[PDB]
Point group: D2
Chain length 291, copies 4
Amino acid sequence: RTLKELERELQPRQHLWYFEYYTGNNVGLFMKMNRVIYSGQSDIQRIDIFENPDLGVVFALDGITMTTEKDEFMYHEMLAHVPMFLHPNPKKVLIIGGGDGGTLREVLKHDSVEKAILCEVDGLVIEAARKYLKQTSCGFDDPRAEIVIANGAEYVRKFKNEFDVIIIDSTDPTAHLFTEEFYQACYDALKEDGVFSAETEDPFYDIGWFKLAYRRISKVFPITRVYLGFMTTYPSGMWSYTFASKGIDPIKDFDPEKVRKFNKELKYYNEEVHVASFALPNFVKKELGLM
Amino acid sequence: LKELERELQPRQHLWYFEYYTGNNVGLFMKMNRVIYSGQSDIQRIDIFENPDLGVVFALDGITMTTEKDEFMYHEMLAHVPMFLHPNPKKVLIIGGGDGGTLREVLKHDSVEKAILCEVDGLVIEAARKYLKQTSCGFDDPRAEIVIANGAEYVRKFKNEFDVIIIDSTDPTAGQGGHLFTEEFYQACYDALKEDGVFSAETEDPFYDIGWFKLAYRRISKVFPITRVYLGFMTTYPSGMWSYTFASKGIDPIKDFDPEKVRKFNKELKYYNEEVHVASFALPNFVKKELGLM
Amino acid sequence: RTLKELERELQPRQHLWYFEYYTGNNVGLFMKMNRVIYSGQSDIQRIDIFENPDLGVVFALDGITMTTEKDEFMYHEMLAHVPMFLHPNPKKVLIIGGGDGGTLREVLKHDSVEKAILCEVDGLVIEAARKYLKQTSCGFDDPRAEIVIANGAEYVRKFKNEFDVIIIDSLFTEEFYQACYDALKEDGVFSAETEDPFYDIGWFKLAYRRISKVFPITRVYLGFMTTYPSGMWSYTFASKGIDPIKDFDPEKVRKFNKELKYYNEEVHVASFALPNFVKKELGLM
Amino acid sequence: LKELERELQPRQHLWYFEYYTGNNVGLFMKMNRVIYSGQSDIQRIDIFENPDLGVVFALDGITMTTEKDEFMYHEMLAHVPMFLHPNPKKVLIIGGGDGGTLREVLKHDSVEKAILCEVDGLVIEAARKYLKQTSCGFDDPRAEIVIANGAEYVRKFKNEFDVIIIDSFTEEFYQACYDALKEDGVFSAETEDPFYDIGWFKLAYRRISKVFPITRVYLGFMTTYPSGMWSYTFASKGIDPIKDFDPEKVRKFNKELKYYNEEVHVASFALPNFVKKELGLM
């Protein structure tokens, strides 16, 4: 009998583990690994893709959990649909980061989209996602999608009055995608009625960055509003996103009917959740100075 | 010893590992020191210090409270039903031996009597000595601590309470626990007055989706008004916690008066008027699981 | 570009770990994993082969460490060379277990060997070793080596007065040991790994008792094993007359024409010196 | 609380992780209970209970002693040089705050005075209160416990000790030990595992051999130390570890020995080829 002929379904045991340390290295999440699908190193970072019995395929960058098959929909739907539904007719979209493709997948559900550019700094992330993260990279081959390997901060400044929507995802490191000038470049790249959303992390372990991102975005966009969503495998489980625009109000200019009549599948986002996500608990309001 | 001792600094050698349902995922926390470890005839108690979370209280290896974030859980479990009741004077809290829910309930000036029914006396004694942030209301003149099984205790009353809150109880028993039966919920209904309200922690709709569904289903078979609300809980499994509000007529949205919250004379670190209403907005996957799509 | 074109040398971090529990499940060893080379499941057990920054390639069966590139020589040399050098002229050797091939590799270093049979119960272990554990499986290609996929306890019973040396690299009953005795020639020798007299004291004592009831000469020897539970490994030498000390000719070792990274004439004799606690467990002193 | 407390039973939630040099491999242990956690101006002390190993003592996350096997280390470090000396009366032990080595040294009736020099006073006090198995010799009239830096302390003596044991590294320090010893004095020092700590092992041997005319490495099993293969370095001004060893002294020993014996003494000096190669002896 040959090697392949002798192989059987791999059963999970209690010897292989993935440890994700949170900011501060005092708390973290651990996951059992049934098998490791891919481990690669680029000039930028390390990529690991493995299988967990409960969460399915897990994608991590430098030991930080990026996506989980069981719950990535929670994150991608909130990051993408809030600004997409708020825009009156989103045709040209720019997504910075999001090498896994999840945000692109959600953006492509909107029929108005004519072109969606996915700007990823690491080519190895795109190649690994295309081969091993099928659930999220399914939009890579869509004719409306254009994948560009570049630093988002450098790429966005090449455009002026070009995009309807700009979304900043979390897969791209920079030790650049969070400076006031970067947000100003995003503002300038957007059209007069353009909208924006950026993942702004957990107001718990990453409170310092959360406050900094809000402050910087607010210095550029007249409308800057934080919204929250559950993210069952991200640090603390309380994730924040920051919606921004040149005038469109996330509550006052929201049309629930657009969501109710939507012709695509949504596993998290809905009209009540859109409005509810903008309600901030007292401790978050205090951190942002919103009383 | 004492003369040679200095401030204890954390290293990378002591850890607390918490396993979630299914045992495939969990949370780990660094321990600067173990404050107390005790074993009762019911369960094991461990209280330790984490550099970021502060004092952590665990029962049988399950995180119950953390100093840094317990307010998120206790405020949502207590304030939703308390603010919805017209004039809550008599309140019964089952479980929650740490005292957090009692502390929040006592913030309401209308309260004349609040009973905390805890099954394990060792939890109460440990909370007094080591969990002062949550046990601060134990000695309030309006408070009464009773050491008994909640399912048996509640049956002794009829048309007695304005509010009944079911906090954490027997976490290792899961959905098969005594405080998750239709009989128990019916006893709660019977112990409540004609216009009484109720709230119960109903787990995370992720790792414990089945338990969550069972609790909602059984509560809904007893109370005419049953509504799930959600809240962040930064150190509980998945971070997405659910609670179930129930009543004999009072609607959590139609009968909510934001002015009661705006004019509240006590500190609130999580709960507010907007959060109250927002907590009842359920994501699609939750609605589908409850048959509300 | 393509995947391979963008790939660089993989650097270890603090997120991937292998945890091995010792008997009792109260103590264990953990290792950082730079990458996992192979994970497979047979009808018998699970195989995992991964890379550790300090130990190199590590091979584990059901979460139990079997071999590491950095120190496997310590175990394989002590298990094989003690009985091999003690035999007057070892020509036919039977190895039960040892699917990684390390013991076979050491046995083949002896020029007198004409045939060495490696009897492994799991064919997938042999295939994985051939493909991923070249350091230990290099002997698979030797014309004198014969790999047999079979249950060792059932296999050895098919032979009588056949082998010069029998090595147990893994199969614990007195009946099994008697079968080994019967399969050996009149002047045959035997060795078996008998675990650590610490976490596995129970098995250690049982193995010694059963082997000693069958063989006239039964002596325990010890060796360092830097990645096995406790680091104190025991082996049991047995024969039908050959004494491991009195009949040892150090010149055979001194003049050996092959590389030895652990075993030598001084270590051979020294390995038979047992600490008091071990002697007490065996009922010696 | 007192009336409600019961026997504390172990679970799978409290753990001790000990990282080995390099931080790529380590040992983990279940902790049923933590007995003591303290911090001195020098280091952190942790004493806890493991279901299989019993009481475990760690310094800065490094395992120092285990109730189940500490005898292996303490007996090999102390008895090899003690039995090799003709009549050991004055002994100096540098380090070993737990007291295990002192306990073993005191078993020899010939000892009149044994000085235990520990740098951290908190270790001595913690050992006296929580590590009774090893600190049992603290009150012996022949024992003298001093709190000081061993490197500076040994310099106060010249031609004073019969035996010097290092239970804890410059050529200058080893020369001071040589000078503190009498004309026929013996020496022993723990020299780590020739695996994860190969660098330290080689350095210690080189430095000791440059001072003492007779320097020989011996090995011993240590079931809870990194790799399980522990080395010790014997040194003297003429006494040979093998040639001058009298097995009768060990056979007639009127005290308990759980590891050390006459055959083990001789066997411990047999070094595997890889160790000989690292020491330049091959």
